[PDB]
């Protein structure tokens, strides 16, 4: 296959580099495009004959030229050419541009009860979101009253943004017959050493 | 000039899979080779094959045994038909195009392999034996007391993915959609939510409008307030 | 309605004539060329 570093980052205002490499780069034309976590990815170098990107040629390589990079551009670079045949063409292991001192985001938590119509639908999904945060790590527990639950909690994994940050969901799996019968909930995120607890009840509003 | 795409959704084991890519909109359409490319959940992008007009299409090593690309130009559309569909073959599909600029002949080679500029927004393809399953949204009423905030629970779905908008699709500035978790039960289930402040809180009728684009069962549930 | 075409390489020097001693170098020419005829006779031969 084509071969591509893993990764090279650099601090924002300097220039990062993303190379290709392979067998058909002796007698082809390399193209590259940048894809964004679940995003379609982003065409940027073309075949144009016989504004911040540009690909150099090296024997049997080619080098990408990111001057000056941000925020936006933290995503992942597939470089791409075709065959000497030309009966295929193929792309690279992708490169994750990560922009370096990002800033430390904390976690923003929204907690909600079950609705009117689940409890008469015997479920209780209860929902603690979290949004706008920096670097892509939390860490959640979740505390019936004071005390922890065992069985019932699901979460899914960091997604990056609009905004380039991070966000994520969680919810606990109970009974109609369990959200009445305690005193309160509370959601619970860790993020980088800091966090915050959200109280709702089955007798508040 | 606008790509679109029309298929199932979700696959079953060692049956046959089938695709769509339509041509709404385009001057130059004969011109390319039309082609497919897949990725895995959060991986890389791998490429089919594409097929020219004129029929000669062009495939990958592999899947020689599995596939072949038509064409009804009559749209124009071209069509993938693959076999042998497994478990490993889950992922996002998204159909492309291969550009072919030339500038006055073609057989003595005065052309090139522009690239794959264009391409689709992605249906996912998910292998499997297990059953759709159209959703069952539920009210996260909001806050009573201005800026407040609310949402809308979707759970008990199957397969990926569901993608949403409010108010008929007037809001995506200051939005949240957030991911869905496949309950240990083997559904799917997510959430949804508006920045939606607190004075209007009295005399609107805010809807919120779900699509399950695997189930063809879109939906119109009123998230009403918290009484 | 469209055409077709013939692929032509394009040579200078030659040794035409079987003048045994005598092979010389065309002038490149400026601007594109064009030439144009009526296509009127052919040289062909068979088999046994």
């Known amino acids: 296959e084509l071969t591509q570093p893993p990764s090279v980052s650099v601090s924002p205002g300097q220039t990062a580099r993303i190379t290709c490499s392979g067998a058909?780069?002796?007698?082809?034309?390399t193209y590259w495009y940048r894809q964004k976590p679940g995003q379609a990815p982003v065409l940027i170098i073309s075949?144009?004959?016989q504004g911040r990107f540009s690909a150099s040629w090296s024997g049997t390589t080619v080098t990408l030229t990111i001057r000056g990079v941000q925020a936006d551009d933290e995503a992942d670079y597939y470089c791409?050419?075709?065959?000497?045949?030309?009966?295929?063409?193929?792309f690279g292991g992708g490169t994750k541009l990560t922009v370096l001192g990002q800033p430390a985001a904390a976690p923003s938590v929204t907690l909600f009860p079950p609705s009117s119509e689940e409890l008469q639908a015997n479920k209780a999904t209860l929902v603690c979101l979290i949004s706008d945060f920096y670097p892509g790590a939390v860490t959640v527990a979740w505390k019936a009253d004071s005390s922890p639950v065992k069985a019932g909690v699901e979460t899914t994994t960091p997604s990056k943004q609009s905004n380039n940050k991070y966000a994520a969901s969680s919810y606990l799996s109970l009974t109609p017959e369990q959200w009445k019968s305690h005193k309160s909930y509370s959601c619970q995120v860790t993020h980088e050493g800091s966090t915050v607890e959200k109280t709702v009840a089955p007798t508040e509003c | 000039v606008q790509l679109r795409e029309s298929g199932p959704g979700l696959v079953k084991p060692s049956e046959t899979l089938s695709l769509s890519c339509t041509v709404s909109?385009?001057?130059?359409?004969?011109?390319?080779?039309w082609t497919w490319v897949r990725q895995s959940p959060g991986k890389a992008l791998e490429w089919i094959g594409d097929?020219?007009?004129?029929?000669?299409?062009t495939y990958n090593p592999s899947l020689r045994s599995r596939v072949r690309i038509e064409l009804d130009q009559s749209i124009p559309r071209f069509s993938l038909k693959m076999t042998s569909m497994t478990a490993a073959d889950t992922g996002m599909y998204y159909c492309?195009?291969?550009?072919?600029?030339?500038?006055?002949?073609?057989?003595?080679?005065?052309?090139?392999?522009?690239?794959?500029?264009?391409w689709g927004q992605g249906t996912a393809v998910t292998v499997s034996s297990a059953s759709t399953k159209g959703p069952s949204v539920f009210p996260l009423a909001p806050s009573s007391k201005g800026t407040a905030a609310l949402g809308c629970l979707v759970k008990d779905y199957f397969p990926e993915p569901v993608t949403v908008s409010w108010n008929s699709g007037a809001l995506t500035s200051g939005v949240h959609t957030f991911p869905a978790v496949l309950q240990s039960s083997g559904l799917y289930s997510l959430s949804s939510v508006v920045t939606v402040p607190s004075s209007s809180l009295g005399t609107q009728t805010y809807i919120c409008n779900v699509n399950h684009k695997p189930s063809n069962t879109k939906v119109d549930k009123r998230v009403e307030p918290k009484s | 309605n469209d055409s077709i075409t013939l692929p032509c390489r394009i040579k200078q020097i030659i040794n035409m004539w079987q003048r045994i001693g005598q092979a010389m170098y065309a002038p490149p020419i400026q601007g594109v060329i064009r030439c144009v005829s009526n296509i009127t006779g052919l040289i062909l031969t068979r088999d046994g």
């Open positions: 791409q050419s075709s065959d000497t045949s030309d009966s295929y063409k193929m």
């Open positions: 075949r144009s004959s």
């Open positions: 909109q385009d001057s130059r359409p004969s011109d390319h080779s």
């Open positions: 097929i020219h007009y004129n029929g000669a299409t």
């Open positions: 058909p780069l002796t007698s082809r034309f």
């Open positions: 492309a195009r291969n550009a072919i600029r030339i500038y006055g002949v073609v057989a003595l080679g005065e052309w090139f392999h522009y690239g794959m500029d264009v």
